[PDB]
Design an enzyme around this catalytic site. Structure first.
Site, mmCIF file in Angstrom:
data_model
loop_
_atom_site.group_PDB
_atom_site.id
_atom_site.type_symbol
_atom_site.label_atom_id
_atom_site.label_comp_id
_atom_site.label_asym_id
_atom_site.label_seq_id
_atom_site.Cartn_x
_atom_site.Cartn_y
_atom_site.Cartn_z
ATOM 1 C CG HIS B 87 -1.608 16.944 -29.647
ATOM 2 N ND1 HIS B 87 -1.097 18.552 -29.778
ATOM 3 C CD2 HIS B 87 -1.295 15.984 -29.236
ATOM 4 C CE1 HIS B 87 -1.009 17.988 -28.907
ATOM 5 N NE2 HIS B 87 -0.922 17.577 -28.069
ATOM 6 N N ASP B 90 -1.661 20.546 -40.253
ATOM 7 C CA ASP B 90 -1.354 21.507 -41.943
ATOM 8 C C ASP B 90 -0.794 21.567 -41.769
ATOM 9 C CG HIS B 92 2.110 26.618 -44.324
ATOM 10 N ND1 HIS B 92 2.407 28.063 -44.134
ATOM 11 C CD2 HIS B 92 0.777 26.058 -43.221
ATOM 12 C CE1 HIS B 92 1.718 28.050 -43.206
ATOM 13 N NE2 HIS B 92 0.944 27.530 -42.783
ATOM 14 C CG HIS B 127 1.252 25.072 -38.100
ATOM 15 N ND1 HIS B 127 -0.068 25.323 -37.715
ATOM 16 C CD2 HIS B 127 1.369 26.174 -39.573
ATOM 17 C CE1 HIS B 127 -0.516 26.343 -38.702
ATOM 18 N NE2 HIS B 127 -0.106 26.432 -39.384
ATOM 19 C CB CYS B 128 -0.968 21.564 -33.841
ATOM 20 S SG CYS B 128 -2.055 20.297 -33.091
ATOM 21 C CG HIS B 138 -1.612 22.706 -29.698
ATOM 22 N ND1 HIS B 138 -2.539 21.050 -30.037
ATOM 23 C CD2 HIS B 138 -2.847 23.373 -29.281
ATOM 24 C CE1 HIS B 138 -3.772 21.325 -29.048
ATOM 25 N NE2 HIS B 138 -3.873 22.563 -28.528
ATOM 26 C CG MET B 143 3.182 20.616 -31.340
ATOM 27 S SD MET B 143 1.042 19.535 -30.926
ATOM 28 C CE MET B 143 1.933 18.749 -32.423
ATOM 29 C CG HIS B 248 22.491 40.343 -39.873
ATOM 30 N ND1 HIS B 248 23.399 41.009 -40.793
ATOM 31 C CD2 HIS B 248 23.619 40.433 -39.313
ATOM 32 C CE1 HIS B 248 24.047 41.641 -40.829
ATOM 33 N NE2 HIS B 248 24.742 40.997 -40.048
ATOM 34 C CD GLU B 272 22.181 45.928 -45.397
ATOM 35 O OE1 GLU B 272 22.863 46.288 -43.673
ATOM 36 O OE2 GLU B 272 21.227 46.312 -45.281
ATOM 37 C CB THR B 273 19.373 42.080 -42.939
ATOM 38 O OG1 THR B 273 20.523 42.553 -41.960
ATOM 39 C CG2 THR B 273 18.205 41.460 -41.817
ATOM 40 C CG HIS B 299 19.882 43.273 -37.227
ATOM 41 N ND1 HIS B 299 20.106 44.246 -36.446
ATOM 42 C CD2 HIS B 299 21.573 42.611 -37.546
ATOM 43 C CE1 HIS B 299 20.963 45.238 -36.560
ATOM 44 N NE2 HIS B 299 21.688 43.840 -36.975
#
Ligand SMILES: OC[C@H]1O[C@@](CO)(O[C@H]2O[C@H](CO)[C@@H](O)[C@H](O)[C@H]2O)[C@@H](O)[C@@H]1O
Ligand SMILES: OC[C@H]1O[C@@](CO)(O[C@H]2O[C@H](CO)[C@@H](O)[C@H](O)[C@H]2O)[C@@H](O)[C@@H]1O
Ligand SMILES: OC[C@H]1O[C@@](CO)(O[C@H]2O[C@H](CO)[C@@H](O)[C@H](O)[C@H]2O)[C@@H](O)[C@@H]1O
Ligand SMILES: O=N[O-]
Ligand SMILES: O=N[O-]
Ligand SMILES: O=N[O-]
Ligand SMILES: [Cu+2]
Ligand SMILES: [Cu+2]
Ligand SMILES: [Cu+2]
Ligand SMILES: [Cu+2]
Ligand SMILES: [Cu+2]
Ligand SMILES: [Cu+2]
Lengths: 334, 334, 334
Positions: B87, B90, B92, B127-128, B138, B143, B248, B272-273, B299
């Site tokens: 494994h 990373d 972001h 995440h992996c 993964h 992950m 939402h 709203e969303t 939603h």
């Protein structure tokens, strides 16, 4: 208790919108609407496919309700005894009780009156939400519409300039899930209830069989094409209650676009295509510059061309050659 | 080499978040976290479907790490010998080496320590990503988690006003791909390795079998409902590492929303969303105005109601009739 | 009639872009482009799958055309007699006649010349749109590209600062729909015409078999990796003519991003992942801070890793340990 003037509104069937002011000097009112639920089987395509629809006021989408910031919206919802299911209504514009769903549950034979205050401006979805797996079912069956909450001073560009629209159309996009049989023909059902099992299996695979504006393939073409003239500023409100859409005016732009659909944010300018989040509505204004046909589409062209999602606009006026010209008509390659 | 104070952090399991300051007068520190990878079979639905999960710290999503702009994040990643796969991780939020993936590859039995500087504010996915077809595998296996990088002065509305949250919850949405057998029952597998072939065929068709908050259908309902009181300003962080989501708050709004999830941009207001791009996280703050149950959902109501994607909030306080009132309870149609 | 200087442009094959100025002191010109349509069978994956492609200028995507606000774009479109279908072209940057589609319809053996004025700045899709079900067909077959309309003063951050790019690459993402046979092998067809029926059945289910940058799996890796050096500001233009995408630079950020792709709106800053609406293009600028490999992907990792959607960048320069450091290399767990 609440001591204010009452105003009744006659709702009109989409894509039209009931008469209303943009900017207004009236103070807050109680605005009264009636919605009646209709279950009915309907034809959704030109090859005659039928569909167990459930609608506010007999249309897909439900009619658009317009009010101003601060008004109180008082809605009578009626579930006639000829309907077979309990229904309710939730407004995304409203605060509390699952947007009203939790106060509005009514069996066939009943009605209910709800009042909510319009504290937030923009365009918002309303939809049925009875509970559990029924929620998605009633929505993709047609029980969704929209409500526009204008600011008292009307719309602005974010830079201090008024934006007044000369007309407004409401375009409701509906993802529909109609199951096929062994031979690959669409199935017809006697009742909403009997459609439920097959519709549910298909819904869970998330691929709609039809995506339509205003309830049917072709609804907003031919005799029912939207219209404008060169020079008119047109507002288009677009709702999608369950699945995302990417509207595009072919031949045109969005001069001002509230893609999230809320007027406390400044519109973006100059868009080719915009995005309506599933469970929301947005608004786009355009001043027509040229005459002719425009197509309004979701720019998933498969959906647009192949699954039902196209409206036409028919625009009158004088061609402008400065903007666009055919220099040389088709001809043999020299 | 790097001469600065060290601060250890005990991570907590989502949807909670480890204690942290919003605005701070501390200078840059090295903030130290430990993550241990756990492969395990888990129950993802109320009908008892099992799933070969791979997790940071035994949870889905991974815990949320909070730090301020300029801090240095020093992460120990541990792949115990009871795991069967290599494994990595990373971020972001980080700059270089595929977000750290290229320095963090570890076989079972190994560990690695990585330091990156927090130059950009917002919420970001981690995440992996081991390589090739393994990357998606993964991730959709659990992950993934998130890291929030606050500005030293805390959050602001873009118009000079502080936005302080009274609490913060982390909601991790996971698209899961569990294959069915000939009879249409979900399949169980002995090892992640053996699930791989069938999971891979199904993944490529892009339709998840389950979409869940916090690892399981129902995880954030009943006894584990999120809570607030009328008047509390609540920040909700939402991550989706592979597929888009449209959160939402039913009965509520997003008062301030960073839908792209990066705090150098001003929040939008009154939503709203909102839309969480696959491979990203976003954040939304809301001040509760009314008590009762709210549902937090994506939603796509099919996903929400039918595939697992609903959390509840339970809010205490005084009902406000001005905002919303049942004028007339259900009753026979006159 | 239109009395202005003419400038010819030699278009280059993506991901490169023909030479152009960013800011310019030239006045409006008529900029002349030629596009020739090519129908051809091509290899889209490393296992040798073939595809009936239809292209502008023999490439997928079509070449990027760059012009400034106010210029007049004069395009010669040529449909050689070796093609079997009528084609046309619609520009999202243009106003009227379905973006030009309605003036540009040409059979094999013909050509047409069209002029439109560049009134709106940003990056915009162009694509074929012959009519009816043919529209989606030609587009997902490769007949789409983009056109960038710069402001005369060049790009700005919205806060008065110039943003000058040192290079620009054009990345065209293509969703492709290749049907399988009974045994589950991809099918080959003799002609575009014969591929149509099977391709159409599959298209309507909305799940692509391949998603590729620049026409092929692996097109922008190995010898054709995009390049930069630490310190270079790179603009990446991304188009998607039919289906949404979520680009992400692994190891990097979007320092400035026009996700809607229109330069009258201020860029957002600091993005991890952005969203390209189907039927649109967007642009993102990044200054590289570290050397090594970066992957540019859509952060549907299934699409990225499994269906073809990955480009590489190869960046030269000096590693910066302050930004990111391996503190302790892999090692046995103590
Ligand atoms: O012709 C019978 C044969 O067809 C199948 C299709 O796989 O099923 C069809 O016929 C059944 C019994 O006649 C129907 O009840 C069924 O609904 C229909 O699909 C097989 O089941 C059967 O062996
Ligand atoms: O009953 C046998 C019959 O069923 C099929 C289903 O199409 O396959 C099942 O039986 C096979 C051999 O018994 C199993 O190995 C297979 O995995 C299972 O689906 C046919 O193959 C077979 O003719
Ligand atoms: O082996 C014959 C048997 O296979 C099926 C698959 O369901 O069809 C195959 O064979 C047909 C006639 O030989 C082909 O024309 C057809 O295209 C191919 O799939 C059955 O139809 C048939 O009973
Ligand atoms: O043919 N009915 O499934
Ligand atoms: O029943 N197994 O595919
Ligand atoms: O094997 N052809 O469908
Ligand atoms: Cu209902
Ligand atoms: Cu809703
Ligand atoms: Cu892993
Ligand atoms: Cu990632
Ligand atoms: Cu064509
Ligand atoms: Cu188009």
């Amino acid at each position: 208790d609440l001591k204010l003037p009452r105003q009744k509104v006659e709702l009109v069937a989409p894509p039209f919108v009931h008469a209303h002011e943009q900017a207004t000097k009236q103070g807050p009112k109680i605005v009264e609407f009636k919605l009646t639920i209709e279950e009915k089987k309907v034809v959704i395509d030109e090859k005659g496919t039928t569909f167990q629809a459930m609608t506010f006021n007999g249309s897909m989408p439900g009619p658009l309700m317009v009010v101003h910031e601060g008004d109180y919206v008082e809605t009578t919802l009626v579930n006639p005894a000829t309907n077979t299911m309990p229904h309710n209504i939730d407004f995304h514009s409203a605060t509390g009780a699952l947007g009203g769903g939790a106060l509005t549950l009514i069996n066939p034979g009943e009605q209910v009156v709800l009042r909510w205050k319009a504290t937030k401006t923009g365009v918002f979805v309303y939809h049925c939400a009875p509970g559990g797996p029924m929620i998605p079912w009633h929505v993709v069956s047609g029980m969704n519409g929209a409500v526009m909450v204008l600011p008292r001073d009307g719309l602005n560009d974010g830079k201090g300039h008024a934006l007044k629209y000369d007309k407004v159309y409401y375009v409701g996009e509906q993802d529909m899930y109609v199951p096929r049989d062994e031979k690959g023909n669409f199935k017809s059902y006697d009742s909403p209830g009997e459609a439920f099992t097959d519709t549910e299996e298909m819904m869970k695979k998330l691929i709609p069989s039809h995506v339509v504006f205003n309830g049917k393939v072709g609804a907003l073409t031919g005799k029912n094409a939207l219209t404008a003239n060169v020079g008119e500023n047109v507002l288009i409100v677009h709702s999608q209650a369950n699945r995302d859409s990417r509207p595009h005016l072919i031949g045109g732009h969005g001069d001002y676009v509230w893609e999230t659909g809320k007027f406390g944010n400044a519109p973006e300018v100059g868009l080719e295509t915009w995005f309506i989040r599933g469970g929301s509505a947005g608004a786009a204004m355009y001043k027509f510059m040229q005459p002719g046909i425009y197509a309004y589409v979701t720019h998933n062209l498969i959906e647009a061309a192949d699954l039902c999602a196209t409206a036409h606009f028919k625009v009158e006026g004088k061609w402008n050659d400065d903007l666009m010209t055919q220099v040389k008509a088709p001809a043999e390659i020299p």
